[PDB]
C-alpha cells in the first residue's frame, strides 16, 4: 500500500508538472488559492514557472524512487505470477518512463539547464527496464531499442551496467528485437549484447540465422583492440550458425526463382549509380560485376536450374563481348555507351523470358527436396515471435515443396510456392527476389504494436478492431518470403470483375472514359503530355473548373459497383449485411492506421479483399511517414482513400455513420497512450537501413510515379521531422497543416508550391479543415477534417492518374 501511495503521488506530481510545462500561463487561469497551494507543494520560492516545474519534477522523482525502493524490499516470491509482479513491474515502468521522457525532452532542446538533475537517469532507466523485463513485462519488452539507443548516447554510464545486468535476462525475450542486436555487433557497444546473441544462437539458431545473414553483408569492423574482438565474435557466431549449410542452399534455391532479366536490371542500375556519383571506382565496380556474374554468368553454378540455365547460355557471351572478362572494359566504359548497351541487353532479354510453371525446371533443389537422415531439419521461416517462450518442437518443419509455381502478372513477376510441412498441411508463400523486404517487416511490426494497443482499449476491444497482418520474412538484402493470403483478390480486380462486358469495354477503351478523359483534361489545362501537366494544371485551373470536371468524370463510372460486387457473392441478406459491415470496419481502421503511419501509395491494387469475409487487407508499404507527399513529383494530398465507391457502398447511410465512429474510436485509442507507438516509430525512423539511398533503389525498382534516378540529386531526407509530424498527429494537429508542412519540406522550390498548399489547406467556404485551429483538435474534429480532405473534389481532381481518384 505504501508503494502504491508513492506511485500515485509521483504520478500526480508528474501530471501537474506536465500540465504546467505545456501551458505556463494556465497557472493564472486557476484561483489564487489553488495557485498558492501548487506553489507550496512545488517547494520552490522564486515563483518562476521553470522553478515550480523543476520543483514538481523533483518531488515526482523522489516519490517514484521511494516507491521503487519500497518495491525492491521483501518482494521475492518463488512463483513469480502475474499477480504479485503487477505492482513491481508498475513501479519499475513508471520510474523508467518518467526518467525516459525527461531524457527525451532534454535531448530536444539545445539549451540544457537540467544537467545535474538528469545525471543518474540513463543508468536508472536501463536498470529498471531490465529488471522489469526479467519479470516478463510486455511494456518493457517493447521498449528495448530505447535502451539500445540510450547506451549509445550515454556509454560511460550505462555500457558496463547493461552488460552486467542483461546477463540475467532470458534470451527468448529478445527474439522480437534480434535484428537490432545483430546489427550493432560491429559497434563499440557490441559487448552489451554479445552474451544474449550467443545464448540465442545456442538455444534458438533458427530465430537468428536470417537476421545474422542480413547483417553480415554490411559489417565494417574497425582496426582497434575491440574491433578485432567483435570480428572474432561475429566469426564464431557465423561458424556456429553454419551448421550444415542447409539455410544457404535453401536461400540459393529460393533465389533461383527470381527472374534473371530483373537481377541484371538492378545490377545495371546500381553500377550506373556507382559509375556517375564519384569518379569511376575500380574496386567497387569490379566487386559488383563479380557478384553479378557469379549468378548470371557462370553455367557451373551449384544449384542452377533450367530457367536460369537458358538465360546463362543465351547471355553469357554478351557479358564477354561487351564487358571485359571480369569488368576491365566496364571500368573504362563511359556512362553514355553503358546506357545504350544496357538498354539493348534489356530489350533482347525481355523479348523472351517465359517464366516456367514447374518447380523441377526452375529450381532443382526444391523439386527433389528429401528429408535426410541425421541431418539438420529445415523450418518454415517466420514462426519465432518474441511474445513468450518458443517451443521449437511445435514449429512446422519443411517436408517438401509442391511442384506447381504460380507467376503473378505484375512488374517484378513474383513467384508463389507451396511449402508442405510436417504438419500435413500446405503453406503458400510469395517469393519476391531482388527486393529489400525489411521495411515491410518493420511496418508489419508497427501494425502488430497497433493491434496490441487496440486490444487494450475498451471501445475498440468491444468492436474487435484488429488490423489484418501477415508474416514478412526477409532472408537477404535481395530476397524474402511473404505469407500468401488465401482466397483474396485486389480491390481493382473486384471492381473490374463486377463490370459487364460493355461497361468494362467502355471504361478501358472508350475515349470518353475517365482514364482517357482525365489525361485529355490535363492536356487542355496544361498543354503538355508529360508529368509537367500536373505542375501546370495546379497553376492554371481554378477550383470550380476542376471540381465540375471531376464531378462530371465520376458520373461515367457505375455507382453501386461495390454493392453489386457484394450482392453477387452473397446468397442471403444476412451475408451481404455482414460483408458490407466488415468491409466498412476494416477500411476505416486501415485508413486511420495508415494516416497515423503516413502511408501514401494507396491505389486500388494495394487493397486486398477477402472473398469469404469481406475484410480489407493493406499491402505494398513502400511509402511511409509522408514519403509520398514529400518526394513524389505529383504530390498526394489525401490522407487515405475514401473515393466515390466507398461512399456509395454505405448508401443510404452517410459517411458520418459506421466508418466515422470506427475512425474516431481508433484515433482515441491511439492518442490515449501514444508513448509506446511513438517510441516504436522513433526506433523505426532511426534505422540505418532506412536512409535515402535505400529509398532511391526502392523507387527505382518500381518506377510507378517517381520522376527518375537523377532528378533528386540532393538527399533532403529528414529523419527527425517524420517522428515530429507523427507526434503532432498523435497530439491533435490539423491534417491540412501536416500536409502543408510535408509539402514545404518536399517541394519548396517548385513553381506550384503555393498552389499545392492552397489546395491542401482548402477554403473556408466549402471544406471544414481551414475553419479549425492548427492544433489542439479533438479526435472527432480530426476525423471530420480527415474525411473532408480525403473526399475533397478539388484534391481528387488533381491526383495522379494511376491513383484513379474517380473510382
Amino acid at each position: 500500500a505504501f508503494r502504491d501511495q508513492n506511485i500515485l503521488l509521483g504520478t500526480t506530481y508528474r501530471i501537474i508538472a506536465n500540465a504546467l510545462s505545456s501551458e505556463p500561463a494556465c497557472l493564472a487561469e486557476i484561483e489564487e488559492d489553488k495557485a498558492r497551494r501548487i506553489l507550496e507543494l512545488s517547494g520552490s520560492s522564486s515563483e518562476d514557472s521553470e522553478k515550480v516545474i523543476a520543483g514538481l519534477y523533483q518531488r515526482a522523482f523522489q516519490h517514484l524512487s521511494e516507491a521503487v525502493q519500497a518495491a525492491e524490499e521483501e518482494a521475492q516470491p518463488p512463483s513469480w505470477s502475474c499477480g504479485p509482479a503487477a505492482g513491481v513491474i508498475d513501479a519499475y515502468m513508471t520510474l523508467a518512463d518518467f526518467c525516459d521522457q525527461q531524457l527525451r525532452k532534454e535531448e530536444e532542446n539545445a539549451s540544457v539547464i537540467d544537467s545535474a538533475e538528469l545525471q543518474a537517469y540513463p543508468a536508472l532507466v536501463v536498470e529498471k527496464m531490465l529488471k522489469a523485463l526479467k519479470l516478463n513485462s510486455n511494456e518493457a519488452r517493447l521498449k528495448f531499442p530505447r535502451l539500445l539507443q540510450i547506451i549509445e548516447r550515454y556509454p560511460e554510464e550505462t555500457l558496463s551496467l547493461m552488460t552486467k545486468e542483461i546477463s540475467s535476462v532470458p534470451c527468448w525475450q529478445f527474439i522480437s528485437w534480434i535484428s537490432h542486436m545483430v546489427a550493432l555487433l560491429d559497434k563499440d557497444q557490441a559487448v552489451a549484447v554479445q552474451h544474449s546473441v550467443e545464448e540465442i544462437t545456442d538455444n534458438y539458431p533458427q530465430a537468428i540465422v536470417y537476421p545474422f545473414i542480413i547483417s553480415s553483408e554490411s559489417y565494417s569492423f574497425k582496426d582497434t583492440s575491440t574491433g578485432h574482438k567483435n570480428k572474432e565474435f561475429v566469426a564464431r557466431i557465423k561458424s556456429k550458425l553454419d551448421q550444415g549449410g542447409v539455410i544457404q542452399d535453401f536461400i540459393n534455391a529460393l533465389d533461383q526463382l527470381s527472374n534473371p532479366e530483373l537481377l541484371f536490371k538492378d545490377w545495371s542500375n546500381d553500377v550506373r549509380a556507382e559509375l556517375a556519383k564519384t569518379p569511376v571506382n575500380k574496386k567497387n565496380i569490379e566487386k559488383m560485376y563479380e557478384r553479378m556474374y557469379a549468378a548470371l554468368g557462370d553455367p557451373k553454378a551449384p544449384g542452377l536450374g533450367a530457367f536460369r540455365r537458358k538465360f546463362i547460355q543465351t547471355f553469357g557471351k554478351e557479358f564477354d563481348k561487351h564487358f571485359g572478362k571480369g569488368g576491365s572494359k566496364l571500368l573504362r566504359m563511359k556512362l553514355s555507351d553503358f546506357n545504350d548497351i544496357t538498354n539493348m541487353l534489356l530489350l533482347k532479354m525481355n523479348k523472351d523470358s517465359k517464366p516456367p510453371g514447374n518447380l523441377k525446371e526452375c529450381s532443382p533443389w526444391m523439386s527433389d527436396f528429401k528429408v535426410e537422415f541425421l541431418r539438420n531439419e529445415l523450418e518454415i521461416p517466420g514462426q519465432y515471435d518474441g511474445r513468450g517462450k518458443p517451443l521449437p518442437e511445435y514449429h512446422v518443419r519443411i517436408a517438401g515443396f509442391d511442384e506447381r509455381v504460380t507467376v503473378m502478372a505484375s512488374l517484378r513477376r513474383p513467384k508463389r510456392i507451396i511449402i508442405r510441412g510436417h504438419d500435413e498441411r500446405e503453406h503458400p508463400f510469395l517469393v519476391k527476389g531482388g527486393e529489400d523486404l525489411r521495411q515491410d517487416q518493420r511496418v508489419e511490426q508497427l501494425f502488430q504494436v497497433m493491434n496490441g494497443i487496440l486490444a487494450q482499449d475498451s471501445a475498440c476491444s468491444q468492436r474487435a478492431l484488429q488490423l489484418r497482418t501477415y508474416s514478412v520474412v526477409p532472408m537477404t538484402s535481395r530476397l524474402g518470403l511473404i505469407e500468401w493470403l488465401e482466397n483474396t483478390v485486389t480491390l481493382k480486380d473486384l471492381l473490374l470483375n463486377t463490370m459487364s462486358q460493355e461497361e468494362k469495354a467502355a471504361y478501358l477503351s472508350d475515349p470518353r472514359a475517365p482514364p482517357c478523359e482525365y489525361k485529355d483534361w490535363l492536356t487542355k489545362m496544361s498543354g503538355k503530355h508529360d508529368v509537367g501537366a500536373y505542375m501546370l494544371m495546379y497553376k492554371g485551373a481554378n477550383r470550380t473548373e476542376t471540381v465540375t470536371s471531376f464531378r462530371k468524370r465520376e458520373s461515367k463510372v457505375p455507382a453501386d459497383l461495390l454493392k453489386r460486387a457484394f450482392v453477387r457473392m452473397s446468397t442471403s441478406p444476412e451475408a451481404f449485411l455482414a460483408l458490407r459491415s466488415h468491409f466498412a470496419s476494416s477500411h476505416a481502421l486501415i485508413c486511420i492506421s495508415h494516416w497515423i503511419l503516413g502511408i501514401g501509395d494507396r491505389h486500388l491494387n494495394n487493397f486486398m479483399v477477402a472473398m469469404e469475409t469481406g475484410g480489407v487487407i493493406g499491402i505494398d508499404f513502400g511509402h511511409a511517414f509522408g514519403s509520398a507527399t514529400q518526394f513524389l513529383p505529383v504530390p498526394e494530398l489525401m490522407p487515405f482513400r475514401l473515393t466515390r465507391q466507398f461512399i456509395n457502398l454505405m448508401l443510404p447511410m452517410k459517411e458520418t455513420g459506421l466508418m466515422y465512429s470506427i475512425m474516431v474510436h481508433a484515433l482515441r485509442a491511439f492518442r490515449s497512450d501514444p508513448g509506446l507507438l511513438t517510441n516504436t516509430m522513433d526506433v523505426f525512423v532511426k534505422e540505418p537501413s532506412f536512409d535515402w539511398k535505400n529509398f532511391e533503389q526502392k523507387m527505382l525498382k518500381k518506377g510507378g510515379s517517381w520522376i527518375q534516378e537523377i532528378n533528386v540529386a540532393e538527399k533532403n531526407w529528414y529523419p527527425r521531422q517524420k517522428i515530429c509530424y507523427a507526434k503532432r498527429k498523435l497530439a491533435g494537429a490539423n491534417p491540412a497543416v501536416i500536409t502543408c508542412d510535408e509539402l514545404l519540406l518536399g517541394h519548396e522550390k517548385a513553381p506550384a508550391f503555393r498552389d499545392y498548399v492552397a489546395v491542401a489547406r482548402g477554403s473556408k467556404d466549402h471544406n471544414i479543415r481551414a475553419q479549425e485551429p492548427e492544433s489542439g483538435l479533438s479526435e472527432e474534429t480530426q476525423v471530420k477534417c480527415l474525411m473532408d480532405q480525403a473526399t475533397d473534389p478539388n484534391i481528387l481532381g488533381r491526383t495522379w492518374e494511376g491513383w484513379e481518384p474517380w473510382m
Binding site: 537422415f373 541425421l374 541431418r375
Partner: protein, 269 residues
C-alpha cells in the same frame, strides 16, 4: 535405373531396401548384356574402385555421407540421448548387414574381396561394438553412451519394446550374416576372428540358446520364436564345421551341463 537401384540399396528404410534389392536382382539379368548379377558387378567393379561398392553398402542410400561409414560406433552422435537417434543407427547397421548378407550370400561378390581389403570399412567395428556393448544389456546400455553425464530416467514400455525389437532383429541379422560367411567362404573365417567372433558372438549365442528373454526376445509372439531356433541351429551347425568348434563347446558346457539339469529338476512338487 539399375544404377539408381544399386546406389539406393544401403538405405535404412527396411521395406524400401528389400524392394530395391529385389528389383536389382530382377532387372540385372535382363540387361542388354543378358548376364548374371555376378558378372555385371564384376565388370562394373573394374572401371572404378571397390571403394564405390563399399560406400554404397555402408553409406546410406538417402544420405550419401550419412551411413555407418561416417559413424561406425554409437559414440559419434553429438546430440543428447534419444530413442529416435538410437533406432536410426540401429537401422543403418541393419541395412548394412542385410546388404552384405544378400550380396555375399548370393555369390554376387567374394567374402574376401569386399571385407578383407585395405579400403575403409566400418562393418566389423560396428558389429563388434554392438555385440560388446548393446547386444547384452537393456536400453541403459544405449543411454550410457549419449553424453554419459546426467543419465535419463525410467522408460515407457513401448519405448523399451521397440528398442528390444530392433536389437533382437540386429542380433538375428548378425547371426545370419556369420552363418552366411561360414557356409559360403571356407577360408573366410580369418577376418572374422579379429573382433567379430573372439568372445562376444559366442557369449551372445550361448545366451540366446539358454535364455532368450535375457536379451529381449519377447516370448508372446510366434512369428519370430519360430525362426529364432532355426537361425540358432544353423549358426551352431556352421560353427561345428569350423575351427571355432572348441570355443563354442567350452562356452556351451560352461553354460549348460548335466548337473545343472539335475539341480534344476531335483525338486518338482
Amino acid at each position: 535405373l539399375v544404377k539408381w537401384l544399386l546406389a539406393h540399396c544401403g538405405r535404412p528404410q527396411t521395406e524400401c531396401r528389400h524392394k530395391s534389392i529385389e528389383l536389382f536382382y530382377k532387372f540385372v539379368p535382363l540387361l542388354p548384356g543378358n548376364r548374371s548379377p555376378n558378372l555385371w558387378l564384376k565388370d562394373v567393379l573394374k572401371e572404378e574402385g571397390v571403394s564405390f561398392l563399399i560406400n554404397t553398402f555402408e553409406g546410406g542410400g538417402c544420405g550419401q555421407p550419412s551411413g555407418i561409414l561416417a559413424q561406425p560406433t554409437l559414440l559419434y552422435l553429438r546430440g543428447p540421448f534419444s530413442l529416435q537417434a538410437t533406432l536410426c543407427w540401429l537401422d543403418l547397421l541393419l541395412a548394412a548387414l542385410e546388404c552384405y548378407n544378400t550380396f555375399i550370400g548370393e555369390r554376387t561378390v567374394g567374402a574376401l574381396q569386399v571385407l578383407g581389403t585395405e579400403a575403409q570399412s566400418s562393418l566389423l567395428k560396428a558389429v563388434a561394438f554392438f555385440l560388446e556393448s548393446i547386444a547384452m544389456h537393456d536400453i541403459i546400455a544405449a543411454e550410457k553412451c549419449f553424453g554419459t553425464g546426467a543419465a535419463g530416467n525410467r522408460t515407457s514400455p513401448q519405448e523399451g519394446e521397440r528398442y528390444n525389437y530392433s536389437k533382437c532383429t540386429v542380433v538375428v541379422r548378425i547371426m545370419e550374416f556369420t552363418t552366411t560367411l561360414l557356409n559360403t567362404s571356407p577360408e573366410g573365417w580369418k577376418l572374422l576372428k579379429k573382433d567379430l567372433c573372439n568372445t562376444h558372438l559366442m557369449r551372445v549365442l550361448v545366451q540366446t540358446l539358454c535364455e532368450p528373454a535375457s536379451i529381449g526376445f519377447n516370448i508372446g509372439d510366434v512369428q519370430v520364436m519360430a525362426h529364432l531356433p532355426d537361425v540358432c541351429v544353423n549358426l551352431m551347425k556352421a560353427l561345428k564345421m569350423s575351427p571355432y568348434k572348441d570355443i563354442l563347446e567350452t562356452h556351451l558346457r560352461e553354460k549348460i551341463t548335466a548337473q545343472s539339469i539335475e539341480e534344476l529338476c531335483a525338486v518338482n512338487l
